[PDB]
């Protein structure tokens, strides 16, 4: 995180601001990574 | 002795070819590299690129000009 903070503070206004750092406007598709337990008996955690 | 004006014109035009030629080569190489790195600014740099060539061209033209001043 510290190295990434230094690198992001270094680069400003680049060509489409990198690739993974690109603030791509007109958002049309969002992918979600949800992490859940493999087994039950957790309580309200999986439901929450 | 023969006419030294021919030798003068030849030397002037040849050196005006040597100097601005290498200058233009370096300018074009640098501009091409910069365009290949950051294309999003290319117009700005290419404008500056032409400016540099202009000055080099002027120097070469200067030699040619004085070459004509020796030619006739």
PDB file of C-alpha atoms in Angstrom:
ATOM      1  CA  UNK A   1       0.000   0.000   0.000  1.00  0.00           C
ATOM      2  CA  UNK A   2       2.825   2.434   0.787  1.00  0.00           C
ATOM      3  CA  UNK A   3       4.598   1.671  -2.499  1.00  0.00           C
ATOM      4  CA  UNK A   4       1.306   2.023  -4.383  1.00  0.00           C
ATOM      5  CA  UNK A   5       0.609   5.341  -2.646  1.00  0.00           C
ATOM      6  CA  UNK A   6       4.030   6.661  -3.659  1.00  0.00           C
ATOM      7  CA  UNK A   7       3.578   5.445  -7.240  1.00  0.00           C
ATOM      8  CA  UNK A   8       0.079   6.937  -7.548  1.00  0.00           C
ATOM      9  CA  UNK A   9       1.306  10.248  -6.136  1.00  0.00           C
ATOM     10  CA  UNK A  10       4.107  10.139  -8.719  1.00  0.00           C
ATOM     11  CA  UNK A  11       1.875   9.647 -11.774  1.00  0.00           C
ATOM     12  CA  UNK A  12      -0.677  12.368 -12.581  1.00  0.00           C
ATOM     13  CA  UNK A  13      -2.768  12.794 -15.728  1.00  0.00           C
ATOM     14  CA  UNK A  14      -1.200   9.911 -17.640  1.00  0.00           C
ATOM     15  CA  UNK A  15      -2.465   8.240 -20.812  1.00  0.00           C
ATOM     16  CA  UNK A  16      -5.916   7.090 -19.581  1.00  0.00           C
ATOM     17  CA  UNK A  17      -4.257   6.893 -16.115  1.00  0.00           C
ATOM     18  CA  UNK A  18      -2.794   3.449 -16.632  1.00  0.00           C
ATOM     19  CA  UNK A  19      -5.018   0.429 -17.194  1.00  0.00           C
ATOM     20  CA  UNK A  20      -6.148  -0.878 -13.794  1.00  0.00           C
ATOM     21  CA  UNK A  21      -5.928   2.671 -12.395  1.00  0.00           C
ATOM     22  CA  UNK A  22      -8.089   4.076 -15.213  1.00  0.00           C
ATOM     23  CA  UNK A  23     -11.111   6.061 -14.019  1.00  0.00           C
ATOM     24  CA  UNK A  24     -13.262   4.771 -16.869  1.00  0.00           C
ATOM     25  CA  UNK A  25     -16.420   6.861 -17.184  1.00  0.00           C
ATOM     26  CA  UNK A  26     -19.867   5.623 -18.291  1.00  0.00           C
ATOM     27  CA  UNK A  27     -19.930   2.629 -15.967  1.00  0.00           C
ATOM     28  CA  UNK A  28     -22.038  -0.134 -17.518  1.00  0.00           C
ATOM     29  CA  UNK A  29     -20.723  -3.420 -16.066  1.00  0.00           C
ATOM     30  CA  UNK A  30     -19.699  -4.108 -12.462  1.00  0.00           C
ATOM     31  CA  UNK A  31     -18.143  -7.353 -11.241  1.00  0.00           C
ATOM     32  CA  UNK A  32     -18.508  -8.375  -7.601  1.00  0.00           C
ATOM     33  CA  UNK A  33     -16.258 -10.629  -5.524  1.00  0.00           C
ATOM     34  CA  UNK A  34     -18.319 -11.836  -2.569  1.00  0.00           C
ATOM     35  CA  UNK A  35     -16.591 -14.088  -0.038  1.00  0.00           C
ATOM     36  CA  UNK A  36     -18.661 -16.501   2.058  1.00  0.00           C
ATOM     37  CA  UNK A  37     -17.853 -19.370   4.437  1.00  0.00           C
ATOM     38  CA  UNK A  38     -17.644 -22.859   2.975  1.00  0.00           C
ATOM     39  CA  UNK A  39     -19.847 -24.377   5.701  1.00  0.00           C
ATOM     40  CA  UNK A  40     -22.852 -23.320   7.751  1.00  0.00           C
ATOM     41  CA  UNK A  41     -23.366 -22.979  11.511  1.00  0.00           C
ATOM     42  CA  UNK A  42     -21.901 -19.461  11.377  1.00  0.00           C
ATOM     43  CA  UNK A  43     -25.054 -17.663  12.491  1.00  0.00           C
ATOM     44  CA  UNK A  44     -26.218 -14.467  10.810  1.00  0.00           C
ATOM     45  CA  UNK A  45     -22.891 -13.977   9.002  1.00  0.00           C
ATOM     46  CA  UNK A  46     -23.785 -15.730   5.739  1.00  0.00           C
ATOM     47  CA  UNK A  47     -27.256 -14.178   5.762  1.00  0.00           C
ATOM     48  CA  UNK A  48     -25.794 -10.720   6.420  1.00  0.00           C
TER      49      UNK A  48
ATOM     50  CA  UNK B   1      45.582  29.432 -58.621  1.00  0.00           C
ATOM     51  CA  UNK B   2      42.075  28.486 -59.750  1.00  0.00           C
ATOM     52  CA  UNK B   3      38.813  29.840 -58.356  1.00  0.00           C
ATOM     53  CA  UNK B   4      38.557  29.344 -54.595  1.00  0.00           C
ATOM     54  CA  UNK B   5      34.866  30.307 -54.779  1.00  0.00           C
ATOM     55  CA  UNK B   6      33.934  26.771 -55.861  1.00  0.00           C
ATOM     56  CA  UNK B   7      35.790  25.304 -52.873  1.00  0.00           C
ATOM     57  CA  UNK B   8      34.162  27.858 -50.558  1.00  0.00           C
ATOM     58  CA  UNK B   9      30.657  27.076 -51.825  1.00  0.00           C
ATOM     59  CA  UNK B  10      31.306  23.333 -51.594  1.00  0.00           C
ATOM     60  CA  UNK B  11      32.605  23.536 -48.021  1.00  0.00           C
ATOM     61  CA  UNK B  12      29.753  25.796 -46.893  1.00  0.00           C
ATOM     62  CA  UNK B  13      27.009  23.602 -48.357  1.00  0.00           C
ATOM     63  CA  UNK B  14      28.677  20.412 -47.139  1.00  0.00           C
ATOM     64  CA  UNK B  15      29.000  21.622 -43.555  1.00  0.00           C
ATOM     65  CA  UNK B  16      25.439  22.952 -43.645  1.00  0.00           C
ATOM     66  CA  UNK B  17      24.513  19.411 -44.629  1.00  0.00           C
ATOM     67  CA  UNK B  18      26.603  17.879 -41.826  1.00  0.00           C
ATOM     68  CA  UNK B  19      25.370  19.950 -38.913  1.00  0.00           C
ATOM     69  CA  UNK B  20      21.633  20.423 -39.349  1.00  0.00           C
ATOM     70  CA  UNK B  21      21.436  16.872 -40.723  1.00  0.00           C
ATOM     71  CA  UNK B  22      22.577  15.353 -37.433  1.00  0.00           C
ATOM     72  CA  UNK B  23      20.498  17.915 -35.546  1.00  0.00           C
ATOM     73  CA  UNK B  24      17.362  16.895 -37.447  1.00  0.00           C
ATOM     74  CA  UNK B  25      18.222  13.234 -36.903  1.00  0.00           C
ATOM     75  CA  UNK B  26      18.498  13.702 -33.141  1.00  0.00           C
ATOM     76  CA  UNK B  27      15.330  15.838 -33.062  1.00  0.00           C
ATOM     77  CA  UNK B  28      13.295  13.276 -35.003  1.00  0.00           C
ATOM     78  CA  UNK B  29      14.590  10.365 -32.913  1.00  0.00           C
ATOM     79  CA  UNK B  30      13.702  12.155 -29.678  1.00  0.00           C
ATOM     80  CA  UNK B  31      10.267  13.209 -30.925  1.00  0.00           C
ATOM     81  CA  UNK B  32       9.509   9.689 -32.172  1.00  0.00           C
ATOM     82  CA  UNK B  33      10.563   8.202 -28.828  1.00  0.00           C
ATOM     83  CA  UNK B  34       8.450  10.702 -26.876  1.00  0.00           C
ATOM     84  CA  UNK B  35       5.428  10.065 -29.113  1.00  0.00           C
ATOM     85  CA  UNK B  36       5.887   6.321 -28.619  1.00  0.00           C
ATOM     86  CA  UNK B  37       5.948   6.813 -24.849  1.00  0.00           C
ATOM     87  CA  UNK B  38       3.127   9.350 -24.328  1.00  0.00           C
ATOM     88  CA  UNK B  39       0.974   9.735 -27.462  1.00  0.00           C
ATOM     89  CA  UNK B  40      -1.604  11.857 -25.599  1.00  0.00           C
ATOM     90  CA  UNK B  41       0.716  14.903 -25.772  1.00  0.00           C
ATOM     91  CA  UNK B  42       2.020  14.211 -29.293  1.00  0.00           C
ATOM     92  CA  UNK B  43       0.594  17.344 -30.937  1.00  0.00           C
ATOM     93  CA  UNK B  44       2.379  19.611 -28.461  1.00  0.00           C
ATOM     94  CA  UNK B  45       5.710  17.881 -28.890  1.00  0.00           C
ATOM     95  CA  UNK B  46       5.385  17.564 -32.653  1.00  0.00           C
ATOM     96  CA  UNK B  47       4.813  21.314 -32.817  1.00  0.00           C
ATOM     97  CA  UNK B  48       7.995  21.838 -30.819  1.00  0.00           C
ATOM     98  CA  UNK B  49       9.677  19.228 -33.012  1.00  0.00           C
ATOM     99  CA  UNK B  50       9.005  21.243 -36.149  1.00  0.00           C
ATOM    100  CA  UNK B  51      10.262  24.381 -34.407  1.00  0.00           C
ATOM    101  CA  UNK B  52      13.587  22.683 -33.777  1.00  0.00           C
ATOM    102  CA  UNK B  53      13.890  21.520 -37.372  1.00  0.00           C
ATOM    103  CA  UNK B  54      13.066  25.046 -38.523  1.00  0.00           C
ATOM    104  CA  UNK B  55      16.029  26.457 -36.618  1.00  0.00           C
ATOM    105  CA  UNK B  56      18.316  23.734 -37.952  1.00  0.00           C
ATOM    106  CA  UNK B  57      16.891  24.281 -41.427  1.00  0.00           C
ATOM    107  CA  UNK B  58      17.568  28.003 -41.077  1.00  0.00           C
ATOM    108  CA  UNK B  59      21.193  27.264 -40.210  1.00  0.00           C
ATOM    109  CA  UNK B  60      21.502  25.032 -43.264  1.00  0.00           C
ATOM    110  CA  UNK B  61      19.667  27.643 -45.325  1.00  0.00           C
ATOM    111  CA  UNK B  62      22.058  30.238 -43.908  1.00  0.00           C
ATOM    112  CA  UNK B  63      24.972  28.273 -45.320  1.00  0.00           C
ATOM    113  CA  UNK B  64      23.230  27.901 -48.663  1.00  0.00           C
ATOM    114  CA  UNK B  65      22.501  31.631 -48.581  1.00  0.00           C
ATOM    115  CA  UNK B  66      26.143  32.552 -48.118  1.00  0.00           C
ATOM    116  CA  UNK B  67      26.992  29.861 -50.662  1.00  0.00           C
ATOM    117  CA  UNK B  68      24.951  31.822 -53.184  1.00  0.00           C
ATOM    118  CA  UNK B  69      26.761  34.959 -52.007  1.00  0.00           C
ATOM    119  CA  UNK B  70      29.934  33.156 -53.076  1.00  0.00           C
ATOM    120  CA  UNK B  71      28.390  31.624 -56.202  1.00  0.00           C
ATOM    121  CA  UNK B  72      27.570  34.963 -57.835  1.00  0.00           C
TER     122      UNK B  72
END
